[PDB]
Coordinates of C-alpha atoms and ligand atoms in Angstrom, one line a residue:
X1 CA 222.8 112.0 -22.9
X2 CA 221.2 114.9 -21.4
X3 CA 217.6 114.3 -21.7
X4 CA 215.0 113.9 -19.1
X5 CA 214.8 110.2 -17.5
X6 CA 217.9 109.3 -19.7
X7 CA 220.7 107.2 -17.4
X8 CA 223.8 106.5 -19.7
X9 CA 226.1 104.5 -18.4
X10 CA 229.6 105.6 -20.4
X11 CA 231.5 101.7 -20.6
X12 CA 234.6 102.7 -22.6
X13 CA 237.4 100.8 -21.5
X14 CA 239.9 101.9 -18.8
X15 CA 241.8 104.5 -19.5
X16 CA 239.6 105.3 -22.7
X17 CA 239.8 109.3 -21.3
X18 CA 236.2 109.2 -20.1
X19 CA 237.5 111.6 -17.1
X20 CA 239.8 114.1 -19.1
X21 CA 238.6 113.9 -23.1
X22 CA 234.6 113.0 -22.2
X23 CA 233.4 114.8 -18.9
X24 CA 234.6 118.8 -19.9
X25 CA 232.5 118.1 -23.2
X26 CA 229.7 117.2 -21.1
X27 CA 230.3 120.0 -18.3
X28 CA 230.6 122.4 -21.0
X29 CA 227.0 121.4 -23.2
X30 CA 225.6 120.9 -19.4
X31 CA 226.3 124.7 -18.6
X32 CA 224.9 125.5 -22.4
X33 CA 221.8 124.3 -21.4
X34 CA 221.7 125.4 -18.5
X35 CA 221.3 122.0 -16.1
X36 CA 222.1 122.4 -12.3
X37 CA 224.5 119.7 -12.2
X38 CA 226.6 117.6 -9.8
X39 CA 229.7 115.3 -10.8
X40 CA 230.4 112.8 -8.2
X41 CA 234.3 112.1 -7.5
X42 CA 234.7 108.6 -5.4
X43 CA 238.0 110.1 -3.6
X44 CA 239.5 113.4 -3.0
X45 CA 242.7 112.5 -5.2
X46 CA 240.3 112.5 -8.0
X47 CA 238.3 115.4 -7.3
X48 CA 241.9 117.1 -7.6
X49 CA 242.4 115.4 -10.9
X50 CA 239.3 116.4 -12.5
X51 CA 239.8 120.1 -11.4
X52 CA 242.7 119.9 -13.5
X53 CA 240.3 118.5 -16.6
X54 CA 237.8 120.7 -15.9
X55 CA 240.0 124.3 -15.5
X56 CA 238.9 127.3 -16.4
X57 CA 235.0 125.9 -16.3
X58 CA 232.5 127.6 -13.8
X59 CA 232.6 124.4 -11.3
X60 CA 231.7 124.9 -7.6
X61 CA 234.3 122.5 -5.7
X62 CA 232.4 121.3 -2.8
X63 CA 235.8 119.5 -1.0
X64 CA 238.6 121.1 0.6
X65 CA 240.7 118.5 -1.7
X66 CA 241.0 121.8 -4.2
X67 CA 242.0 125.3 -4.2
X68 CA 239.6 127.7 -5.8
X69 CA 238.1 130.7 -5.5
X70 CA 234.8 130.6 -6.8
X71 CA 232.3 133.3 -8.8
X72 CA 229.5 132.4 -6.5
X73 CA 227.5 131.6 -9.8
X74 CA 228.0 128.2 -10.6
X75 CA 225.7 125.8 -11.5
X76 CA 227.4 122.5 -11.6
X77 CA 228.9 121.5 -8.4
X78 CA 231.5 118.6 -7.8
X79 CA 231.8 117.1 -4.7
X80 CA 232.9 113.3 -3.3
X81 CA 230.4 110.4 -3.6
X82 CA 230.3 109.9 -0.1
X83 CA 229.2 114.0 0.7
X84 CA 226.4 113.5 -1.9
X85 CA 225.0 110.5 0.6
X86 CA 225.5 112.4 3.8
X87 CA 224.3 115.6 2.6
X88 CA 220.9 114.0 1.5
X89 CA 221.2 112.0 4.9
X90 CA 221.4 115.3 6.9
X91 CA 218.7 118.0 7.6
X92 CA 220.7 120.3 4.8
X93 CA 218.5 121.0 0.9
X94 CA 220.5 119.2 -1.5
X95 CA 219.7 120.3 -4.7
X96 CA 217.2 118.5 -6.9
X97 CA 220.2 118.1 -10.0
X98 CA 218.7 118.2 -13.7
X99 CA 222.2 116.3 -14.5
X100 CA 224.3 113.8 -12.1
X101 CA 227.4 112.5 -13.1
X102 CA 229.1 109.7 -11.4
X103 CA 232.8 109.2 -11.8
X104 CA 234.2 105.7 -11.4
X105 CA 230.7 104.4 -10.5
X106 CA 231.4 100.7 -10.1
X107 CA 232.5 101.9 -6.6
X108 CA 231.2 99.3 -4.1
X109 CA 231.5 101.4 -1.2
X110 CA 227.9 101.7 0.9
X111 CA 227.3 105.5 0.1
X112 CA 228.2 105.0 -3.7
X113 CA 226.0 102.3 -4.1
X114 CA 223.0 104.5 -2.4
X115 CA 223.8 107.4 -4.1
X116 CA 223.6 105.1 -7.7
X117 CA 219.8 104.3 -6.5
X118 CA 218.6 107.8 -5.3
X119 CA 220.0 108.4 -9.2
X120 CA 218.5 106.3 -11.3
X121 CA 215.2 106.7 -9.0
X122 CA 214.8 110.5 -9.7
X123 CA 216.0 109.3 -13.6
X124 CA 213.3 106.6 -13.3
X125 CA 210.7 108.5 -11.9
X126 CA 211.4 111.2 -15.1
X127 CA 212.6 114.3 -12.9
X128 CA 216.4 113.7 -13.9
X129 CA 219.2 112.3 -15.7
X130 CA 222.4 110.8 -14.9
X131 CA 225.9 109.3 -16.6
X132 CA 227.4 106.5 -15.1
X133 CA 231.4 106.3 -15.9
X134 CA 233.2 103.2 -15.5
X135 CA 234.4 100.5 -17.6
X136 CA 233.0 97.8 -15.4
X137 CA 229.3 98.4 -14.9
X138 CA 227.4 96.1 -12.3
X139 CA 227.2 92.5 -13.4
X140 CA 230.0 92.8 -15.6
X141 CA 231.7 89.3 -16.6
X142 CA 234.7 90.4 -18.9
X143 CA 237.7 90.5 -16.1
X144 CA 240.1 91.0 -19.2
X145 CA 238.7 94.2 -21.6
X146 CA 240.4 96.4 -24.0
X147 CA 243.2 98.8 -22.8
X148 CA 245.2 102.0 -24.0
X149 CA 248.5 99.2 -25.1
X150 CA 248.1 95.4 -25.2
X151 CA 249.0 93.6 -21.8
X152 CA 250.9 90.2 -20.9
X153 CA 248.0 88.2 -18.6
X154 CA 249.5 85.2 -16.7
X155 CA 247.8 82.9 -14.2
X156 CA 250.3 82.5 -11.3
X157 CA 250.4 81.6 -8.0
X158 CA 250.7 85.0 -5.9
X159 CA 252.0 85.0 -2.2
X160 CA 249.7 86.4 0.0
X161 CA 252.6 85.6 3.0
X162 CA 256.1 86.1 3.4
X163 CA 258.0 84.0 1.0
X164 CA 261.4 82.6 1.3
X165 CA 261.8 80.9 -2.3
X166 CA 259.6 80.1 -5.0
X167 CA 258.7 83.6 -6.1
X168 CA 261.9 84.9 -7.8
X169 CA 259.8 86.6 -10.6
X170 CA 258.4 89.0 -7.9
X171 CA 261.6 90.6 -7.2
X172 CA 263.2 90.0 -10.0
X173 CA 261.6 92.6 -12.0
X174 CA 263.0 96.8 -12.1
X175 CA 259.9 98.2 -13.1
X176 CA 257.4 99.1 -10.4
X177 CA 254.7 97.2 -9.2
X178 CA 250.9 97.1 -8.2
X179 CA 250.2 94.2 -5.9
X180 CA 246.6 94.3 -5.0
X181 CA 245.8 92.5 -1.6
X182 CA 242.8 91.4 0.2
X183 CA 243.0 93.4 3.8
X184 CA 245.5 96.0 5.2
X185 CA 247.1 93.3 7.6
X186 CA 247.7 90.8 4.4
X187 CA 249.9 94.0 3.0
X188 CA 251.6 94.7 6.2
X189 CA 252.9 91.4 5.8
X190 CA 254.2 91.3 1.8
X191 CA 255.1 94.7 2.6
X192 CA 257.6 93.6 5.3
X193 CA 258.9 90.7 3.1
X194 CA 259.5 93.1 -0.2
X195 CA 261.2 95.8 2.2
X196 CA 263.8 93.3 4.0
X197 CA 264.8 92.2 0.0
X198 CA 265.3 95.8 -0.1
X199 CA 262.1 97.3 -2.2
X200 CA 260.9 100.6 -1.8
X201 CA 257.2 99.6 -0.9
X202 CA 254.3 102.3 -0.7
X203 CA 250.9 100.8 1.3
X204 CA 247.4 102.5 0.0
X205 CA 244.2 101.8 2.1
X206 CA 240.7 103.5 2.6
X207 CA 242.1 105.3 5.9
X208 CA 245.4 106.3 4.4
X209 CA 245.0 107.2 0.9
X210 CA 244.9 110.5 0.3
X211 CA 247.9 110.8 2.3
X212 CA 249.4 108.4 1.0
X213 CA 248.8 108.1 -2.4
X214 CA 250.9 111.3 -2.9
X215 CA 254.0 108.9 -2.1
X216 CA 253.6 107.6 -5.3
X217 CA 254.3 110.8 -6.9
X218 CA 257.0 112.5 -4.4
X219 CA 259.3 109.4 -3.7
X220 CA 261.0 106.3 -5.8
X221 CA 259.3 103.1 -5.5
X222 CA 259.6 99.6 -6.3
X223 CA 255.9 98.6 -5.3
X224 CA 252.5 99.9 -4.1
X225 CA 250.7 97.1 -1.8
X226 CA 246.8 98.2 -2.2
X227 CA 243.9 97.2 -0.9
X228 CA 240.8 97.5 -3.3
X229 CA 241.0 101.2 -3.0
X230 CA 242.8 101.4 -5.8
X231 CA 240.1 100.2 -8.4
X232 CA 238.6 103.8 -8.2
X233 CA 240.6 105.6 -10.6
X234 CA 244.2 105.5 -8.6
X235 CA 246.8 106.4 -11.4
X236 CA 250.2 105.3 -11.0
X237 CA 253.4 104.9 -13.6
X238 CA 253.7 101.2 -13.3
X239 CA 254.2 98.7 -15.8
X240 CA 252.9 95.5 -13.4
X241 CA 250.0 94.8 -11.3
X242 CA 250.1 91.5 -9.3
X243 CA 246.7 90.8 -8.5
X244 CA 246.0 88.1 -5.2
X245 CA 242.8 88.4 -6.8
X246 CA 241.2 88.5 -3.4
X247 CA 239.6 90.5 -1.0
X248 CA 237.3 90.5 2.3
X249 CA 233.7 90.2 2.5
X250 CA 231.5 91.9 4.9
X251 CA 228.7 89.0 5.9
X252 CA 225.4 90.1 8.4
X253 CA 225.2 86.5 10.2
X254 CA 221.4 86.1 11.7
X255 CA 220.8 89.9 11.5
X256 CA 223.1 90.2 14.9
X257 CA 226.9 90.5 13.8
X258 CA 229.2 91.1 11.2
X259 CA 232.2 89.2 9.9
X260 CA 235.0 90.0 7.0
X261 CA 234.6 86.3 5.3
X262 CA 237.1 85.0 3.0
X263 CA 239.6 86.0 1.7
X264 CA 237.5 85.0 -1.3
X265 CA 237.4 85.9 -5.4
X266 CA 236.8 89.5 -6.4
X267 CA 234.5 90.3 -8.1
X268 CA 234.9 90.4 -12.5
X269 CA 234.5 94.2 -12.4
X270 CA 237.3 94.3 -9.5
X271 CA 239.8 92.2 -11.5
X272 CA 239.1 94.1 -14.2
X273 CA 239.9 97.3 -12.4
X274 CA 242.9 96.0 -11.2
X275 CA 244.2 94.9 -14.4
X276 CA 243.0 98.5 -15.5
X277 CA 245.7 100.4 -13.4
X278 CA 248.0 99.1 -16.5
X279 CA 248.3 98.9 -20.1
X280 CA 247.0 102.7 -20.2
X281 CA 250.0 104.1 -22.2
X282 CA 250.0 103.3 -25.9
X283 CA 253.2 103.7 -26.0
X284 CA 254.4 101.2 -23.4
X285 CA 253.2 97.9 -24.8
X286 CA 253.7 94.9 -22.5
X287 CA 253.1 95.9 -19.3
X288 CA 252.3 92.8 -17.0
X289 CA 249.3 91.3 -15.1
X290 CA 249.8 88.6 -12.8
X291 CA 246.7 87.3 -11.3
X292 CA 246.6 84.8 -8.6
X293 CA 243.0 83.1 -8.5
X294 CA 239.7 83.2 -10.3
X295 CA 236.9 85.5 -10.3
X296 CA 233.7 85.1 -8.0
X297 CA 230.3 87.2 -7.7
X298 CA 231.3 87.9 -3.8
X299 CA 228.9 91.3 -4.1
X300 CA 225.7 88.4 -3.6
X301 CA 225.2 88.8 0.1
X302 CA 227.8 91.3 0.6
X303 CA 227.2 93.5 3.4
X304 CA 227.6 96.8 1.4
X305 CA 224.4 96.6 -0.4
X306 CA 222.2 96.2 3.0
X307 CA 224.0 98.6 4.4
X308 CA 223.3 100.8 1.0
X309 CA 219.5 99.9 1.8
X310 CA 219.8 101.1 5.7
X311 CA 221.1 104.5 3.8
X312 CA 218.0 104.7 1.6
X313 CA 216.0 104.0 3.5
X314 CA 216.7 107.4 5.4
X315 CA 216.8 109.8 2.2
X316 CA 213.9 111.6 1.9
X317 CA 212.6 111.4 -1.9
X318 CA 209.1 112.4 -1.8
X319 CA 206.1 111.8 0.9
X320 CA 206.9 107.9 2.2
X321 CA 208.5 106.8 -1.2
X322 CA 211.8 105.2 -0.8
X323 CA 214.9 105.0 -3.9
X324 CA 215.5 101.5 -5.0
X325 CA 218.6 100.3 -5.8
X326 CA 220.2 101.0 -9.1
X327 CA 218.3 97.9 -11.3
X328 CA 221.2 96.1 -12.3
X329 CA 223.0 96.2 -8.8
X330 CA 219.2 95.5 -6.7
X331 CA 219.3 91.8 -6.4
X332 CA 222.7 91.5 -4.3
X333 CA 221.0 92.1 -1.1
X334 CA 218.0 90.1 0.4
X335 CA 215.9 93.8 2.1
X336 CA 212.4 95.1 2.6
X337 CA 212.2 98.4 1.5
X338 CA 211.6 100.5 4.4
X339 CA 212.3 97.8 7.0
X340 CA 215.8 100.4 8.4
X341 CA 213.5 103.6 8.1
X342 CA 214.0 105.2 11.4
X343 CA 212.2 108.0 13.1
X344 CA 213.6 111.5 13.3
X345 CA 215.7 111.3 16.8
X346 CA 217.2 107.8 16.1
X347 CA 217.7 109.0 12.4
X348 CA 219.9 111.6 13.5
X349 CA 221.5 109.8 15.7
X350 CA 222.4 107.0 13.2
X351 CA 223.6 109.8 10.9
X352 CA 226.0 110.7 13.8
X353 CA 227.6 107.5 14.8
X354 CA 228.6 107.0 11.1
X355 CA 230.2 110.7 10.6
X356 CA 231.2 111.9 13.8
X357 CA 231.7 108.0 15.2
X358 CA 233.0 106.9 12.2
X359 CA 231.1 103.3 13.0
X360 CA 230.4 101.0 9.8
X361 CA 226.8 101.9 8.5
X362 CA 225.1 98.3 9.8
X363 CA 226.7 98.5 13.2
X364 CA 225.3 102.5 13.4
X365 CA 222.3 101.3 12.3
X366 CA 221.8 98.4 15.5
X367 CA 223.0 101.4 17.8
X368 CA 220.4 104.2 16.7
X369 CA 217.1 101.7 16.3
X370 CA 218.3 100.4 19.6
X371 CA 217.0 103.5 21.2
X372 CA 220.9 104.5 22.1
X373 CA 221.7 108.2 21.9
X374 CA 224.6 108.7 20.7
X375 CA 227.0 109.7 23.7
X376 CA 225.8 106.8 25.5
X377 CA 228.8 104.0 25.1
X378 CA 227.6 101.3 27.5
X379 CA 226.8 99.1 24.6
X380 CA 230.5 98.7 24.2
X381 CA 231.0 97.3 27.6
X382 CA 227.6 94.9 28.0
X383 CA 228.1 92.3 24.6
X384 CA 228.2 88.2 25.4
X385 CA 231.7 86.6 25.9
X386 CA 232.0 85.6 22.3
X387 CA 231.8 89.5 21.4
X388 CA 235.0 90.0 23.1
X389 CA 237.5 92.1 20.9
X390 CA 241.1 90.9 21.2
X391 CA 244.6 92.9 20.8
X392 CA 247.7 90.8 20.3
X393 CA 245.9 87.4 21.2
X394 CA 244.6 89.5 25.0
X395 CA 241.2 91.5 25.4
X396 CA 241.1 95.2 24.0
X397 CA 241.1 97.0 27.2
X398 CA 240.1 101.2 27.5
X399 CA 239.0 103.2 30.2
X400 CA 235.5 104.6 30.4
X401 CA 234.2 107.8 30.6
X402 CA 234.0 106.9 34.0
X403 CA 237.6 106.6 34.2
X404 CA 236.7 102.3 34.9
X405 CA 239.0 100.0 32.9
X406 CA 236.7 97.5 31.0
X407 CA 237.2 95.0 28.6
X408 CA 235.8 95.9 24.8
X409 CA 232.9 93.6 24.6
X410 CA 230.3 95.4 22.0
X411 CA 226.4 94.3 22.3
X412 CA 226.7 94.6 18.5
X413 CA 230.0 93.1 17.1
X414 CA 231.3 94.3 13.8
X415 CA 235.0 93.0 12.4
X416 CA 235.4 96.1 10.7
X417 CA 236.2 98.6 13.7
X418 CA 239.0 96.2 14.4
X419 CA 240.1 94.4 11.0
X420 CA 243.8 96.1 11.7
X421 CA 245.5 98.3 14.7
X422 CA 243.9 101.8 13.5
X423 CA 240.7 100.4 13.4
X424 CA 240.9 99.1 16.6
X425 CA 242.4 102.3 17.9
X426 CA 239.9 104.1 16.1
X427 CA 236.9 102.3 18.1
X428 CA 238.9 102.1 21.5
X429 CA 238.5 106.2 21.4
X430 CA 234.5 105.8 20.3
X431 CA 234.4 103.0 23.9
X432 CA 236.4 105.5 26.1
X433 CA 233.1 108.7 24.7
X434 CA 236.3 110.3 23.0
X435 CA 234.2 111.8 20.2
Ligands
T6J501 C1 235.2 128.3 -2.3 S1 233.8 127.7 -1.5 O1 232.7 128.6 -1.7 O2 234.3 127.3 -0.2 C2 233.4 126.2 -2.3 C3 232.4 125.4 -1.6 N1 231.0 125.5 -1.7 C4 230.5 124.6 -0.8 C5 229.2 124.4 -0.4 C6 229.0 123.4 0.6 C7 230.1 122.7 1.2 C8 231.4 123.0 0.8 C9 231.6 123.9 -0.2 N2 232.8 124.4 -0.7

């Protein structure tokens, strides 16, 4: 695997121990050889995990997520997908890797999928090499692969609402549960229903995860409501996932707004990582997957991917070249290369709005080529009426700067930086110039 302009992609089914049996072999024949190398963790819960498969090996941990003192001499470095896509983003030298490894690299996310193509462009262009781990690579088909211990699949019909009757075998099970769901308010709402019948319910999403997740471990519980954040390597001692089979997709309409569509199908490589949070114990045989609609190709057209092109397109590779996409991931978007390269002030300040304004990469994107800096916030306050964001069926109200109340009315509207309370709350403070 570790030859020049060699990208492996490293399929074994879920659960098959590509984290704990497979990566410390290659770590260890990486440091033989002496390859500056970087592993690439999708979340800080697993960057935890894999310090714990990878003890005792000279690793530089380049996340707060783990206690370590290092040597000083390491030469493979671990750090979160997302920090390998801002750090080439930034004015900081990132490290031209002989080796980069990618944990749970079906991750969808807009920083994973841009990392995957600055990847396999320095493996393409023969400076590099690369392993891919997942057992759903793009394009997948197979929602239903092998697993650790056989599992019971049954097409049913999932609530994705409170339910009164009609359901009895979602409560009527003692084991605990996985119940993917399409958005954060969709779980608020099964969550409210399970916890009135008296469950001990757990909700995971992108905001709350690390936090959260560690729930699972410290307390009893009866179910975990998810969103998809839980396809990228989330481990939990269940013995059911119910899967709505659903989730939310980001849509540019006419290059000037964004909506979450649907719910609609996930994706093959999304059921199949949903499915994959059970069966994993060869010793518990008939854990349960309840699945409640088809599969879809909802990545063609999905946001992400342009807004992994608006990344790219700002990474410095060498001279004016720009990283494609990853081959087998290129054709969900419809982009010119280049077309989001930005000049050095607006670049910075489109690298700002997305960490320290936490906006969604497209809607940093209209901001910075805009010619906005990045304190100014009258763009939140000057959008048409149909821009209008809403809080409990009224318009989101903050006060400015300038200490005026104004109605949130963004120039740019994306229905991310409101799709549930925090969000909302989240882009309130960015309106009102709180960072
Ligand atoms: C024990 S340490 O030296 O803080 C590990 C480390 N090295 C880093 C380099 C860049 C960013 C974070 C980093 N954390």
């Amino acid at each position: 695997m570790l030859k020049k302009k060699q990208l492996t992609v490293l399929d074994l089914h879920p659960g098959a121990g590509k984290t704990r049996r497979v990566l410390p072999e290659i770590v260890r024949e990486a440091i033989k050889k002496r390859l500056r190398t970087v592993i690439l963790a999708p979340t800080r819960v697993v960057a935890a995990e894999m310090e714990e498969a990878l003890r005792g090996l000279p690793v530089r941990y380049m996340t707060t997520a783990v206690n370590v003192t290092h040597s000083g001499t390491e030469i493979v470095d671990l750090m979160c997908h997302a920090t390998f896509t801002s750090r080439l983003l930034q004015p900081i030298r990132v490290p031209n890797y002989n080796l980069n490894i990618m944990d749970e690299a079906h991750f969808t996310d807009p920083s994973s999928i841009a990392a995957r193509g600055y990847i396999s462009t320095r493996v393409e262009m023969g400076e590099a090499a690369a392993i891919f781990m997942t057992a759903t690579p793009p394009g997948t088909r197979d929602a239903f692969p092998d697993s650790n211990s056989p599992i019971m699949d049954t097409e049913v019909e999932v609530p994705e609402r409170a339910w009164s009757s009609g359901f009895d075998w979602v409560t009527d099970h003692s084991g605990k549960t996985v119940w993917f769901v399409p958005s954060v308010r969709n779980g608020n709402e099964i969550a409210a229903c399970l916890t009135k019948a008296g469950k001990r319910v757990i909700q995971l999403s992108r905001k709350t995860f690390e936090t959260e997740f560690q729930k699972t471990k410290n307390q009893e519980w009866d179910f975990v409501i998810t969103t998809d954040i839980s396809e990228m390597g989330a481990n939990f001692k269940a013995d059911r996932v119910i899967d709505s089979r659903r989730c939310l997709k980001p849509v540019i309409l006419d290059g000037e707004r964004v909506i979450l569509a649907g719910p609609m199908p996930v994706t093959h490589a999304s059921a199949a990582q949903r499915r994959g949070r059970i069966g994993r114990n060869p010793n518990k045989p008939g854990d349960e997957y309840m699945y409640g609609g088809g599969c879809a190709e909802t990545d063609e057209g999905h946001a992400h991917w342009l807004e992994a092109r608006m990344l790219l397109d700002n990474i410095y590779l060498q001279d004016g070249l720009i990283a494609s996409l990853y081959r087998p991931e290129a054709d969900k978007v419809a982009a010119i290369e280049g077309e989001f390269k930005l000049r050095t002030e607006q670049r910075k300040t489109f690298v700002e709005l997305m960490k320290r304004g936490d906006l969604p990469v497209w809607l940093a994107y209209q901001v910075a080529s805009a010619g906005i800096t990045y304190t100014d916030r009258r763009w939140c306050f000057d959008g048409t009426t149909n821009n209008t964001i809403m809080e409990d069926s009224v318009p989101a109200e903050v006060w400015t700067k300038y200490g005026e109340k104004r109605v949130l009315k963004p120039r740019w509207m994306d229905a991310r930086v409101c799709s549930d309370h925090a969000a909302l709350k989240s882009f309130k403070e960015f309106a009102a110039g709180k960072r």
